[PDB]
Symmetry: C3
Amino acid sequence: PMFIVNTNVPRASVPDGFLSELTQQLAQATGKPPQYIAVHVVPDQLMAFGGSSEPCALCSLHSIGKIGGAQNRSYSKLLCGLLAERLRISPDRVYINYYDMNAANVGWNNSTFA
Amino acid sequence: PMFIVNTNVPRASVPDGFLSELTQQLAQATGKPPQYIAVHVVPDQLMAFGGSSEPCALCSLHSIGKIGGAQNRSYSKLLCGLLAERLRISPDRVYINYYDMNAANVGWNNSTFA
Amino acid sequence: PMFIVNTNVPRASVPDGFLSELTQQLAQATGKPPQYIAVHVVPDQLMAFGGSSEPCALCSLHSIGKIGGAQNRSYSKLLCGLLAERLRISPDRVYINYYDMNAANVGWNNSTFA
Ligand SMILES: COc1cc(-c2ccc(/N=N/c3ccc4c(S(=O)(=O)O)cc(S(=O)(=O)O)c(N)c4c3O)c(OC)c2)ccc1/N=N/c1ccc2c(S(=O)(=O)O)cc(S(=O)(=O)O)c(N)c2c1O
Ligand code: NA
Ligand code: NA
Ligand code: NA
């Protein structure tokens, strides 16, 4: 799975340890081994949410399967939780787009997952 | 809705008010409430369009609904118009990918829109 | 087609000519003219792959058609090869998401490709 967070919070506000915490929490939530989890955090962005420049985040989570209505509600609770507690971003200023990828449409290590 | 622009135009060439202008104009073109519109501008990027490093932009508009053949033409006209006028990027060096998101696949406020 | 690579390798490690090499080789792999290929390299990113931050890349290739099981295997071998040779990124720390876009969902030059 791959999780990306783009945010206007400055880099100095992202705690040491945050990529590793995301990695573990995501391995647990998706049930995938942490070796297959990739995480990307992009701070200091020029962005607005509802017109406002208060702390916000635009995120995505791509996974081959493990995406669906109930799982996505559970991921959002987890990930909004983490963004609130670690980056002090309000959950109503977070979007997370979920993508259930076909294994044939994900390249890795010179091939695809199909 | 979430609109993202990545461009090789430098930050100093992004005029004050640009994020607000996008928010406002997208609210109107899409008909959706502006409190839900997020915008994100990423300047100074290392990019090429057609092999050329002349100003260009690669963009995404994601929304729950309001995505379709006629509507996307209207957004393309609007958004190429703003990138030409404000960032001096030629419309034929702009790509915009449109995504009609399922509500179950967008997290917000600890849950999803489902 | 549009190819984006996000990587933690520093900008000074991206060799001169790399965006042109990606442009040329993708034009060949996809069969589309290079005038229509866009590429975007994002170095110096805060990322982890499998819990750690050795060189890695998270990529996307969007194309109108020319996306499918065999083609994507070939694109993955081509793009992992380039990232390994040119950026010193191991193929097993690369993910590439492939997206077959509908023409009506790609804006360009004030309209869409529909
Ligand atoms: C805004 O639109 C929606 C909103 C909701 C909704 C509302 C409220 C929610 N949360 N409320 C609260 C309240 C208090 C909270 C408090 S508090 O202390 O009590 O204050 C503390 C905390 S805390 O942080 O725990 O402390 C909280 N979290 C709180 C909190 O979460 C919420 O949570 C997830 C979700 C759900 C669905 C919606 N829209 N759905 C669709 C679906 C399809 C559409 C299509 S189509 O069908 O797909 O085509 C086409 C088109 S169109 O083409 O554009 O016409 C459309 N418009 C579509 C469309 O709109
Ligand atoms: Na130049
Ligand atoms: Na896109
Ligand atoms: Na992607």
